[PDB]
Amino acid sequence: MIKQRTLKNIIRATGVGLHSGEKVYLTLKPAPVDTGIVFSRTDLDPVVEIPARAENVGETTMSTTLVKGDVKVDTVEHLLSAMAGLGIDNAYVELSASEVPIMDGSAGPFVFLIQSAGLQEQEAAKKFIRIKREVSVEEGDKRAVFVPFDGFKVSFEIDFDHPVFRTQQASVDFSSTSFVKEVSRARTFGFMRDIEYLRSQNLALGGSVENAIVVDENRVLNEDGLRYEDEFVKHKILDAIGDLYLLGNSLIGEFRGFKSGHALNNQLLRTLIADKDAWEVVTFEDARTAPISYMRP
Numbered sequence: 001m002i003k004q005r006t007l008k009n010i011i012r013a014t015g016v017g018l019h020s021g022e023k024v025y026l027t028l029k030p031a032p033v034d035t036g037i038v039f040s041r042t043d044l045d046p047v048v049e050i051p052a053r054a055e056n057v058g059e060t061t062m063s064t065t066l067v068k069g070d071v072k073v074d075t076v077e078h079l080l081s082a083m084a085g086l087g088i089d090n091a092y093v094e095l096s097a098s099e100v101p102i103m104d105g106s107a108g109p110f111v112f113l114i115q116s117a118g119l120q121e122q123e124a125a126k127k128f129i130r131i132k133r134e135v136s137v138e139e140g141d142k143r144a145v146f147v148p149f150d151g152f153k154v155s156f157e158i159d160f161d162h163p164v165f166r167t168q169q170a171s172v173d174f175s176s177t178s179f180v181k182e183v184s185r186a187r188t189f190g191f192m193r194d195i196e197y198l199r200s201q202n203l204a205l206g207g208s209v210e211n212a213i214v215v216d217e218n219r220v221l222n223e224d225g226l227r228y229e230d231e232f233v234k235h236k237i238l239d240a241i242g243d244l245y246l247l248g249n250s251l252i253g254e255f256r257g258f259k260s261g262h263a264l265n266n267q268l269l270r271t272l273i274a275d276k277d278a279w280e281v282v283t284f285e286d287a288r289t290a291p292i293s294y295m296r297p
């Protein structure tokens with residue numbers, strides 16, 4: 001059977017929040033079968049635990065935020081993208097501050113820390129959410145769709161009226177694409193012209209060329225340039241895989257994003273979860289007949 005996976009060993013990282021600029025200690029720990037991904041504010045007494053599930057999403061303007069009462073965990077999407085990409089079902093994510101560290105702006109550093117620690121297969125069938133019917137949400141020009149598909153593939157289109165903005169559409173299908181090699185290293189991006197305003201709104205306080213592609217009038221300011229010709233749209237795919245993981249299980253289906261973001265992605269997850277005709281939970285007792293496969297642990 002395709003088995004649930006957790007961490008073999010703990011992961012420790014120290015970083016800075018993109019929006020808050022706060023120094024943060026991150027610990028990933030193994031968790032039991034059917035725990036899912038659970039975030040924990042360990043700086044609070046008592047500790048506040050928030051499951052990484054669509055029901056717990058608050059703010060989606062600046063990044064994906066989990067909320068329980070007045071307690072928040074900001075910017076979960078890059079770490080959730082890493083967990084979904086590597087097939088991690090169960091983990092406790094302890095944080096000493098509200099915001100997950102930004103690292104280099106991609107999922108690359110989290111993927112490397114997790115694969116160094118190693119994964120542990122658990123004695124329980126991995127659960128998958130299988131898309132059975134097309135579910136689409138629109139608002140203005142933006143659209144997010146789930147489509148039935150025997151596998152897992154993600155399409156994204158952005159449209160920035162900017163000289164720097166290259167390939168603005170990309171498709172990944174994990175029957176060929178390596179999450180690790182082709183998606184995970186894609187960094188977040190911000191426009192230089194927006195930073196002053198953002199800082200006045202207490203956003204991008206931790207932003208630097210070390211953790212983001214900074215775009216000037218006409219060029220990327222980063223001295224070493226882009227990791228991928230299509231890094232901007234690859235990063236939107238990375239964000240989308242993280243947001244999709246708020247379903248609490250790996251997807252069997254297709255996601256298509258058309259100028260979508262955290263907010264429409266959340267409207268799409270909420271609409272899917274509510275329409276129980278459009279999905280079911282499936283397991284695979286035989287890996288050899290499954291439409292997806294995962295790296296050795």
Ligand SMILES: CC(C)C(=O)N1C[C@H](NC(=O)[C@@H]2C[C@H](F)CN2)C[C@@H]1C(=O)NCc1ccc(C#Cc2ccc(CN3CCOCC3)cc2)cc1
Nearest residue numbers: 062063077188189190195198204207208209212214235239
């Ligand atoms: C254009 C923007 C509205 C958008 O649609 N985005 C889609 C992508 N979203 C994501 O990737 C999500 C949301 C979070 F970004 C993480 N996951 C990307 C980007 C975004 O939200 N980007 C957010 C953002 C905003 C600002 C910065 C920055 C910065 C910065 C600030 C200062 C400095 C230092 N100096 C300042 C003076 O001039 C020289 C440099 C450097 C960088 C990064 C990301």
Ligand SMILES: [Zn+2]
Nearest residue numbers: 077078188239
């Ligand atoms: Zn992002």
